[PDB]
Amino acid sequence: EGRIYVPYVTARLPKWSGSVQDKTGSNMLGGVVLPPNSQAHRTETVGTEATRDNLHAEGARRPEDQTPYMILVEDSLGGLKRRMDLLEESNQQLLATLNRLRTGLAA
């Protein structure tokens, strides 16, 4: 492709933070505070400063990182993965069928 990352003069950084996306990141005790961006972050909310568990669409503190959310290349990456899985499933079915047929014939 001959595409030279990265041309764009760089930012110099955010300082105040939360720059990255779907880092996910965790709180205190807490755990699971959602990747900057997403609806949960937009809404001013209360009760998350000092308590664990999930009070958002995504949660439990058990599963992370960097949640694959919305649609990026990753969604295509996630979508691509899904497609691959579907293809694999289809292949299995076919195989099974064939086998059965053979058996029958033999009998």
Partner: protein, 453 residues
């Protein structure tokens, strides 16, 4: 082979003679849109290259012997005086830079090799009388008579990457003084060797290098250019052009018809080019005198062309599928190359563009301007009234420093390209020779003394 830069590959790929048969655009002086972005110099009809080739022979192996001249301006026409000097210089060996091929295949992979056995330096001295020669020296050794030269091009070379399919391309930079003018074109990354380094590992090309020989051919791929100082004051402003907010090189939709020369080039751009090249425009447009029309001139390479094509939204004419295209059957061939195949039958491809059987069509204009550079002199009237333009001597610039910002809009291409800009400046240098075997030179390129920061 995998390498698409190999001779075998370019010699194996089979093109379809259908795409360019004796009936293509019958009746026009139009060039295939698929070739407008293809280096026309990398052709086996390049008299220039073909000459140098035979100048060495027809054999693969050949013991050459040539004379290389000095091109560095600072010392080209210099007149050294008595004394001894150390004159050293390096020479590349990369076949892909010293050699050139019509196809531009990677010579480095096609077993291309060169070998230098010996190198000598010749110098001719005028048999001038010692008496006179002595007097001449005495004078040339006075600071009041120091020799001075200046690169002919005189301009800082800049290169900005243009991502594939990209259309807009902004470029921030700032000059503390006043230069002469702008000059620019467009080059293909693959055909541009990364200079500065004693070797380019990613340079798999051997065709003509527009960046050096000056074989440009992508100036017809620009739409508009916008210049602004201090990110606010547009230049030239003052409502000079029909479109005071920018320089429209070409328009797609006529609308008013700011196009001239029966092409797609605006009237504003045409005028500018004429003034910056022949100072012609304020008193009628006429073919300038021959001595001013060199291979690197504008008009000399300007070639407008038009053609009509069967309008797609006229009637049920359907789409002439290239896989169904049949013309001169039994004498033609689908993979067009092999012998004759088929059966005599009334062809169908290529719809009529005349005669009572003519179907509704549609006009299409464009143009080409190769081996040339777009110019935008930094003058109040765009005319050349001296090397040191008037604006380049205006207090507004010499007094305070400003910031520059240009935005180039060009046609999308399916490959990495570059925006070759040329900030015309004054690259001058004085040579002072006080004593025997002593050379003191003083360079000075303004603006852009030593880069920008």
């Amino acid at each position: 082979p995998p390498n698409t830069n190999t001779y075998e590959y370019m010699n194996g790929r089979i093109p379809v003679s259908g795409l360019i048969d004796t009936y293509v655009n019958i009746g026009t002086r139009w060039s295939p849109d698929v070739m407008d972005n293809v280096n026309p110099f990398n052709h086996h009809r390049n008299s220039g290259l073909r000459y140098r080739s035979q100048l060495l022979g027809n054999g693969r192996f050949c013991d050459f012997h040539i004379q290389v001249p000095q091109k560095f301006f600072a010392i080209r026409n210099l007149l050294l005086l008595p004394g001894t000097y150390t004159y050293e210089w390096s020479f590349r060996k990369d076949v892909n830079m010293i050699l050139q091929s019509t196809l531009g295949n990677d010579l480095r992979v096609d077993g291309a090799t060169v070998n230098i056995t010996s190198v000598n330096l010749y110098a001719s001295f005028f048999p001038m009388s010692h008496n006179t020669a002595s007097t001449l020296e005495a004078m040339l050794r006075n600071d009041t008579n120091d020799q001075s030269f200046n690169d002919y091009l005189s301009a800082a070379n800049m290169l900005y990457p243009i991502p594939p399919n990209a259309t807009q391309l902004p470029i921030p930079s700032r000059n503390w003084a006043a230069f002469r003018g702008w000059s620019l074109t467009r080059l293909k990354q693959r055909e541009t060797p990364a200079l500065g380094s004693p070797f380019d590992p990613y340079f798999t090309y051997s065709g003509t290098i527009p960046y050096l020989d000056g074989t440009f051919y992508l100036s017809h791929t620009f739409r508009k250019v916008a210049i602004q100082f201090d990110s606010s004051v547009t230049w030239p402003g003052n409502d000079r052009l029909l479109t005071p907010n920018e320089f429209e090189i070409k328009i797609s939709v006529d609308g008013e018809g700011y196009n001239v020369a029966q092409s797609n080039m605006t009237k504003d751009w045409f005028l500018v080019q004429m003034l910056a090249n022949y100072n012609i425009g304020y008193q009628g447009y006429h073919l300038p005198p021959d001595y001013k029309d060199r291979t690197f001139s504008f008009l000399h390479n300007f070639i407008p062309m038009c053609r009509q094509v069967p309008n797609p939204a006229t009637e049920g004419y359907f789409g002439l599928g290239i896989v169904n295209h049949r013309t001169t059957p039994a004498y033609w061939f689908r993979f067009c190359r092999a012998p004759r195949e088929g059966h005599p039958y009334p062809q169908l491809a290529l719809p009529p563009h005349w005669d009572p059987r003519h179907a509704l069509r549609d006009p299409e204009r464009k143009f080409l301007c190769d081996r040339t550079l777009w110019r935008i002199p930094f003058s109040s009237n765009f005319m050349s009234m001296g090397s040191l333009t008037d604006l380049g001597q205006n207090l507004l610039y010499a007094n305070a420093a400003h910031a520059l910002d240009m935005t180039f809009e060009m046609d999308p291409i399916n490959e990495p390209t570059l925006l070759y800009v040329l900030f015309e400046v004054f690259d001058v240098a004085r040579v002072h020779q006080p004593h025997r075997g002593v050379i003191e030179v003083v360079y000075l390129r303004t603006p852009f003394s030593a880069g920008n920061a």
